Design an enzyme around this catalytic site. Structure first.
Site, short mmCIF file in Angstrom:
data_model
loop_
_atom_site.label_atom_id
_atom_site.label_comp_id
_atom_site.label_asym_id
_atom_site.label_seq_id
_atom_site.Cartn_x
_atom_site.Cartn_y
_atom_site.Cartn_z
N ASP A 1 0.84 -1.19 0.00
CA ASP A 1 0.00 0.00 0.00
C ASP A 1 0.89 1.27 0.00
O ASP A 1 0.65 2.23 -0.74
CB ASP A 1 -0.93 -0.02 1.24
CG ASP A 1 -1.87 1.17 1.32
OD1 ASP A 1 -3.07 1.02 0.93
OD2 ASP A 1 -1.44 2.25 1.79
N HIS A 2 1.97 1.22 0.79
CA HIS A 2 2.90 2.34 0.96
C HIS A 2 3.84 2.56 -0.23
O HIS A 2 4.64 3.50 -0.21
CB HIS A 2 3.69 2.15 2.24
CG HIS A 2 2.80 2.22 3.44
ND1 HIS A 2 3.28 2.33 4.70
CD2 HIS A 2 1.46 2.25 3.54
CE1 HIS A 2 2.28 2.42 5.54
NE2 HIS A 2 1.15 2.37 4.85
N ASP A 3 3.76 1.67 -1.23
CA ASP A 3 4.44 1.83 -2.50
C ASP A 3 3.45 2.51 -3.45
O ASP A 3 3.84 3.19 -4.41
CB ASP A 3 4.85 0.44 -3.07
CG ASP A 3 5.86 0.46 -4.25
OD1 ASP A 3 6.39 -0.62 -4.59
OD2 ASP A 3 6.12 1.54 -4.85
C1 HEM Z 1 0.09 -1.92 11.29
C2 HEM Z 1 -1.15 -1.99 10.54
C3 HEM Z 1 -1.86 -0.88 10.02
C4 HEM Z 1 -2.09 0.33 10.60
C5 HEM Z 1 -1.64 0.79 11.97
C6 HEM Z 1 -2.84 1.12 9.63
C7 HEM Z 1 -3.30 2.42 9.85
C8 HEM Z 1 -3.95 3.21 8.93
C9 HEM Z 1 -4.32 4.60 9.15
C10 HEM Z 1 -4.15 5.40 10.43
C11 HEM Z 1 -4.80 5.06 7.99
C12 HEM Z 1 -5.44 6.42 7.74
C13 HEM Z 1 -6.86 6.49 8.30
C14 HEM Z 1 -7.59 7.75 7.88
O1 HEM Z 1 -8.22 7.74 6.80
O2 HEM Z 1 -7.55 8.74 8.64
C15 HEM Z 1 -4.69 3.97 7.04
C16 HEM Z 1 -4.84 4.13 5.68
C17 HEM Z 1 -4.60 3.15 4.74
N1 HEM Z 1 -4.29 1.85 5.04
FE1 HEM Z 1 -3.88 1.07 6.79
N2 HEM Z 1 -3.05 0.43 8.45
C18 HEM Z 1 -2.48 -0.81 8.71
C19 HEM Z 1 -2.49 -1.86 7.82
C20 HEM Z 1 -2.98 -1.80 6.54
C21 HEM Z 1 -2.97 -2.92 5.64
C22 HEM Z 1 -2.59 -4.35 6.01
C23 HEM Z 1 -3.41 -2.43 4.43
C24 HEM Z 1 -3.67 -3.11 3.22
C25 HEM Z 1 -3.47 -4.52 2.98
C26 HEM Z 1 -3.67 -1.02 4.65
C27 HEM Z 1 -3.99 -0.13 3.64
C28 HEM Z 1 -4.23 1.23 3.81
C29 HEM Z 1 -4.45 2.17 2.72
C30 HEM Z 1 -4.34 1.88 1.22
C31 HEM Z 1 -4.66 3.37 3.31
C32 HEM Z 1 -4.66 4.73 2.62
C33 HEM Z 1 -3.24 5.25 2.37
C34 HEM Z 1 -3.23 6.66 1.79
O3 HEM Z 1 -2.96 7.62 2.54
O4 HEM Z 1 -3.50 6.80 0.58
N3 HEM Z 1 -3.46 -0.64 5.95
N4 HEM Z 1 -4.21 2.82 7.63
C1 LIG Z 2 -1.99 1.82 6.44
N1 LIG Z 2 -1.06 2.45 6.29
CA LIG Z 3 5.41 3.52 -6.06
#
Ligand code: HEM
Ligand SMILES: [C-]#N
Ligand SMILES: [Ca+2]
Ligand SMILES: *[C@@H]1O[C@H](CO[C@@H]2O[C@@H](C)[C@@H](O)[C@@H](O)[C@@H]2O)[C@@H](O[C@@H]2O[C@H](CO)[C@@H](O[C@@H]3O[C@H](CO[C@H]4O[C@H](CO)[C@@H](O)[C@H](O)[C@@H]4O)[C@@H](O)[C@H](O[C@H]4O[C@H](CO)[C@@H](O)[C@H](O)[C@@H]4O)[C@@H]3O)[C@H](O)[C@H]2NC(C)=O)[C@H](O)[C@H]1NC(C)=O
Ligand SMILES: *[C@@H]1O[C@H](CO[C@@H]2O[C@@H](C)[C@@H](O)[C@@H](O)[C@@H]2O)[C@@H](O[C@@H]2O[C@H](CO)[C@@H](O[C@@H]3O[C@H](CO[C@H]4O[C@H](CO)[C@@H](O)[C@H](O)[C@@H]4O)[C@@H](O)[C@H](O[C@H]4O[C@H](CO)[C@@H](O)[C@H](O)[C@@H]4O)[C@@H]3O)[C@H](O)[C@H]2NC(C)=O)[C@H](O)[C@H]1NC(C)=O
Ligand code: HEM
Ligand SMILES: *[C@@H]1O[C@H](CO)[C@@H](O)[C@H](O)[C@H]1NC(C)=O
Ligand SMILES: *[C@@H]1O[C@H](CO)[C@@H](O)[C@H](O)[C@H]1NC(C)=O
Ligand SMILES: *[C@@H]1O[C@H](CO)[C@@H](O)[C@H](O)[C@H]1NC(C)=O
Ligand SMILES: *[C@@H]1O[C@H](CO)[C@@H](O)[C@H](O)[C@H]1NC(C)=O
Ligand SMILES: [C-]#N
Ligand SMILES: [C-]#N
Ligand SMILES: [C-]#N
Ligand SMILES: [Ca+2]
Ligand SMILES: [Cl-]
Ligand SMILES: [Cl-]
Lengths: 466, 104, 466, 104
Positions: free
Chosen positions: D94-96
């Site tokens: 996701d972070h990529d």
């Molecule tokens: C260690 C596990 C994970 C978190 C801790 C975590 C936390 C978040 C938070 C705080 C957000 C933002 C919430 C908001 O809208 O205010 C968030 C966004 C996104 N995640 Fe998270 N995440 C954890 C783990 C995952 C996993 C396993 C993911 C997918 C398989 C996953 C995805 C995403 C995505 C795509 C977003 C949006 C990123 C963006 O800023 O575009 N997360 N997560």
């Molecule tokens: C989820 N970052």
């Molecule tokens: Ca990328």
């Protein structure tokens, strides 16, 4: 700055550069005036620049009523409760209404005849005065609105101004939709693209995006290939109206004084009905009246409409020919030979390649109008795709489409199916002989013409509030 | 957007209840394909001297018009199956659909 | 208005209101902090508000290298010509590299343990420290780059620092692509959706838009349903590593000090391999460690991730459930009974209808994670469609996709086909026993584990310039 | 964009040569569907008290979470066919792909 008075390339200008040895603009360092279209997000370093539509995309006769509230209110007669559109208070056309005059800063219409002092007209759209034939169409629908409001008032004595205006406006918008989809589009696209892009209407779909696509603003300019080099004016027996029956188009742009002082809209409407459009052909694409002398009386030099169309597509960041062919599911010619096959004209393919190098870079308007015309249509496959795709979205994505459930009653829909442009002309002018349907095909007097008295009026009985 | 309505708004606003600006005036055009600018985001092809478009020089719009669009006016072919009204309705209709504003 | 310390609703804050009888926050004057995502065109009365992606959409390991030039430069060791990524200068993990520390104004990692004074880590992406398991993955890829650069330097003596960096970065990017498409995505989507949305790769298509869709930023959050309530750490024989083998997630968020002072990444990586993920069930959607205690140590109140996801979709103007189903060509349930059939769960359909009134308004994340999982997949039809559609675009519309002709030689592609996450772990840690492929399925030690010595390393011979 | 290159740029710029910013960092997301805001162009549903969405009250995000997402942790089902690494690779990937900035 003024993009009209200098050739400096700086915001907001994008002047057209001149090729060596141009047959008209001999000084190669000069240019053709051009202002970039206003960006949707001014000065952004994040957004991909996009342009703005100032109008409602819907086929809702907004060129008559306006697309902004202050204007819409100013176009209405608020002196009474009759629900009318304001009419000119200084001039009439043989007793019939003319559009009121606008109040512009650098009014271009005044320049077309300095001594006549007739300013541009005020309409729902800012371009009503661009050519007198357009003005005549704007004037025709203004009268039809007032005609409808008047009849509705007899039908429904208790209806107030707002109700009469809205009910008349509703009918006018429906008339523009029917003439457009029933009579006009089939002759643009041909029967095959008509079936493909505009299959029978089933229902309003709130998931259909009704917005005008950026590319459509350029693709629908195919119509520039239809323009004749003259404005034709005919008298009541469809004979040349002396002393000037054929006026060069370069002297009618913004010439609002001709409507006011040269016989009103009747000679103009007859000329539109009994004169052939220009046919688009691969070696006869667009006339010099618009290619060398566009807006000659109101600019420092004559503009070039075809060239402006191409510069506009670049201003708008529009993809080239092959990308649009691909978008449309049409084969993408990569060589001069392949382009020759697609265009059924190797000579034209060679010319396009000498200019562009690759069919990937041909500007959408140029490539679009270069394609051979579809059977019983006036655009090739690419323009048919873009135009057909757009009009389906404007039909299916319009909650107020005339056939949508709840907009008109079944009996009102049956009455509206009888409307036609020939009848509308009959009801609002001194013309008593008009074209046989289809008005867009009919073009030869007296062969293609009939008496107005053979055409039944629109029946407004079902608009009577029980 | 009112729960119910009997007439179109003047701006086109609220025609589409879920996305009430769709088809309304003074909004950006929708794009059917991503824009293609010299710098990727704003400058038009033909702006910067020497910048090619996809391997080839940008053809002057005026050169294309001169070399491909220009034709002898006495060669004009009248369309035996279309009236000039067909031309004029198209422009009138165009003016119901779009107007791309420019600075004055 | 400070969105972190105030509950006033004013730009740019959109705090989540607290309902009556909330299980945790009994004070309805409180709220859950929320900042609206930055608009692409600030203050516009013309553009429809959109949000910004600060990263490259491509699967190019930008979380390792950075998506902006200043950062990408700062992440590099510019003290020599070895083409390495900079490593931590103050701490090591059993003689192995840690990510360099970042320099943040208000460092949240410092707040997770006041006396440890371990700041957040500096990486290609700003969230590397959000949880120690994620940091471990970032750290693993940093080491693999430096390991690749080192071997490459031996094979090609003339390659300068830049060349080594780019070639190692190119390999790591292909590894992320291979692990993602070969191992990960099939287990997300299931076999049917995998074949439907990701048919066999043909070649680079420059007409495929590779941008991340706004909806994907919320849909891919399906992964929040896989989160276990603890961070599990295991010693070299895969036994609970004492004295804190199961740390509550609410005490690991931004706890960079745990990586530095509690045993490095090996215990964490072994925990990830030998512990089951949480399964998403319709009445076991997401745990209270993220629903009640998200980021509890680094701010005034614990957040709720599922609730933030739903508030975020609204912030981003995302259409509701039925609109996305329609987009995907899936039936749109209008009654509680129809929703019950779609979810194969009447009880969940009733809860959703009680909350939303109509399936049209179900927020995309909620509706998506509510659907029954596809066979051998971990998302339902709707999410499979959104996720599958996005990844096909990131693949087909990437000029540097590892299988695109010209990117790698045939022998280089043959070599890359032998890479795996388990091997990368073997090459960059003190772990000698790892999961059998597929690493994303294997989760039981010792049944699913093998010796590193049985996994052939990546052979870089075909990278020889000779 | 360079006529020829050897590697990815850091920002992603020039990957798509016809439209240089596609997939590049610090650019607006693409929309697969028109946006749906309370006012049509900017305010999120749930912003203005009493303003409904498509005929129905907007449910508080925290209320939906409490009523549908909340569950007793002892009921947790360990996935017998997925490792926790399945979750972790997901977040790393996701972070990529995306990071949506917010004001500090
Ligand atoms: C260690 C596990 C994970 C978190 C801790 C975590 C936390 C978040 C938070 C705080 C957000 C933002 C919430 C908001 O809208 O205010 C968030 C966004 C996104 N995640 Fe998270 N995440 C954890 C783990 C995952 C996993 C396993 C993911 C997918 C398989 C996953 C995805 C995403 C995505 C795509 C977003 C949006 C990123 C963006 O800023 O575009 N997360 N997560
Ligand atoms: C989820 N970052
Ligand atoms: Ca990328
Ligand atoms: C390279 O990729 C291009 C993009 O392909 C898409 O994404 C990839 C990743 C795959 O998933 C692929 O399957 C996707 O299609 C691809 O070009 C695309 O090709 C299709 C098929 O030719 C094009 O669809 C046609 O579109 C026209 C225009 O209307 C479309 O756009 C409007 C506006 O957004 C929408 O409202 C419409 O619903 C359409 O989406 C349609 O007129 C046409 O349909 C008509 O014709 C078909 C065939 O007779 C009939 O069945 C229909 O009923 C209609 O009568 C198609 O739907 C698509 O526009 C085009 N996209 C682009 C960006 O060019 C290209 O082919 C790929 N090349 C290779 C070698 O792989
Ligand atoms: C109401 O109108 C809606 C819009 O319809 C379009 O415009 C009208 C005017 C007509 O011209 C119509 O023909 C046009 O489609 C309409 O919703 C639309 O329905 C279609 C069909 O289900 C949807 O297409 C599917 O899309 C998904 C998602 O991907 C799409 O978007 C991405 C991103 O832009 C593109 O890259 C893709 O190419 C797609 O365009 C696809 O996954 C799906 O294809 C897959 O499944 C089919 C079926 O098994 C396979 O054949 C394919 O190979 C794939 O495996 C379809 O392409 C479309 O997204 C959707 N649009 C919207 C805005 O929701 C709705 O059905 C109409 N309702 C009624 C009652 O008329
Ligand atoms: C009396 C006949 C017509 C003109 C005179 C005329 C002129 C123009 C001009 C000057 C432009 C702008 C050029 C530029 O980019 O600088 C223009 C734009 C458009 N046209 Fe024109 N046009 C005449 C006639 C037609 C007909 C018959 C058309 C369609 C059948 C037609 C279409 C268009 C369209 C769609 C545009 C763009 C409008 C916008 O601002 O969005 N024109 N035309
Ligand atoms: C308004 O209507 C009345 C009655 O038809 C007419 O006399 C008057 O001229 C109209 N005013 C305008 C501005 O059109
Ligand atoms: C200008 O208008 C006047 C009428 O006011 C007319 O007599 C004259 O002929 C017009 N000028 C030209 C060049 O036709
Ligand atoms: C750069 O590389 C050298 C050699 O491996 C190493 O000693 C040095 O610490 C590195 N510097 C940084 C900041 O990582
Ligand atoms: C905080 O870090 C210190 C090391 O400085 C460690 O001894 C202590 O256990 C940590 N605090 C907690 C609550 O774990
Ligand atoms: C002006 N009347
Ligand atoms: C043309 N207007
Ligand atoms: C930092 N070292
Ligand atoms: Ca309109
Ligand atoms: Cl477009
Ligand atoms: Cl979207």
């Amino acid at each position: 700055v003024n993009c009209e008075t200098s050739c400096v390339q700086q915001p907001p200008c994008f002047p057209l550069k001149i090729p060596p040895n141009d047959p008209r603009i001999k000084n190669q360092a000069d240019c053709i005036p051009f202002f970039r279209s206003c960006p949707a997000c001014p000065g952004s370093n994040i957004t991909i620049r996009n342009q703005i539509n100032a109008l409602t995309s819907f086929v809702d006769a907004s060129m008559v009523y306006g697309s902004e509230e202050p204007l819409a209110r100013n176009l209405r007669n608020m002196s009474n409760q009759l629900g009318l559109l304001a009419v000119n208070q200084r001039f009439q056309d043989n007793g019939r209404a003319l559009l009121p005059f606008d109040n512009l800063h650098d009014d271009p219409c005044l320049l077309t005849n300095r001594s006549a002092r007739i300013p541009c007209f005020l309409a729902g759209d800012t371009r009503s005065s661009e050519m007198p034939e357009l003005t005549s169409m704007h004037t025709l629908l203004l009268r039809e609105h007032n005609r409808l409001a008047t009849e509705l008032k007899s039908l429904n004595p208790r209806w107030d101004g707002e109700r009469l205006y809205q009910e008349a406006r509703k009918i006018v918008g429906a008339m523009v939709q029917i003439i457009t989809y029933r009579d006009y589009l089939p002759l643009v696209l041909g029967p095959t693209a008509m079936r493909k892009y505009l299959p029978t209407y089933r229902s309003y779909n709130d998931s259909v995006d009704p917005r005008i696509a950026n590319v459509f603003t350029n693709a629908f300019r195919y119509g520039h290939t239809l323009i004749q080099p003259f404005m034709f004016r005919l008298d009541n027996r469809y004979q040349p109206m002396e002393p000037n029956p054929r006026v060069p188009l370069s002297r009618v742009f913004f010439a609002s004084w001709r409507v006011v002082l040269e016989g009103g809209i009747d000679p103009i409407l007859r000329g539109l009905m009994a004169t052939p459009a220009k046919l688009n052909r691969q070696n006869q694409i667009a006339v010099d009246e618009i290619r060398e002398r566009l807006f000659e009386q109101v600019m420092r030099i004559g503009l070039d409409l075809p060239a402006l169309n191409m510069q506009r597509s670049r201003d708008h960041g529009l993809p080239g020919y092959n990308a649009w062919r691909r978008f449309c599911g049409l084969p993408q010619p990569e060589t001069v030979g392949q382009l020759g096959t697609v265009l059924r004209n190797l000579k034209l393919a060679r010319k396009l390649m000498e200019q562009y190098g690759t069919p990937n870079n041909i500007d959408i308007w140029m490539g679009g109008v270069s394609e051979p015309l579809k059977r019983k249509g006036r655009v090739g496959p690419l323009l048919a795709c873009i135009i057909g795709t757009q009009f389906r979205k404007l039909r299916d994505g319009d909650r107020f489409w005339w056939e949508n459930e709840g907009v008109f009653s079944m009996q009102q829909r049956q009455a509206l199916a009888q409307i036609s442009l020939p009848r509308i002309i009959c009801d609002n002018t001194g013309i008593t002989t008009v074209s046989k349907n289809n008005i867009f095909m009919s073009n030869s007097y007296p062969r293609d013409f009939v008496n107005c008295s053979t055409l039944p009026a629109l029946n407004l009985a079902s608009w009577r509030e029980a | 957007c009112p729960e119910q309505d009997k007439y179109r708004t003047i701006t086109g606003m609220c025609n589409n209840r879920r996305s009430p600006t769709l088809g309304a005036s003074n909004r950006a055009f929708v794009r059917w394909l991503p824009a293609e600018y010299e710098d990727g985001f704003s400058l038009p092809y033909g702006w910067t001297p020497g910048v090619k478009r996809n391997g080839f020089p940008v053809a002057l719009a005026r050169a294309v018009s001169n070399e491909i669009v220009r034709f002898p006016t006495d060669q004009l072919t009248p369309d035996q199956e279309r009236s000039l009204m067909f031309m004029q309705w198209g422009q009138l209709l165009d003016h119901d659909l779009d107007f791309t504003p420019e600075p004055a």
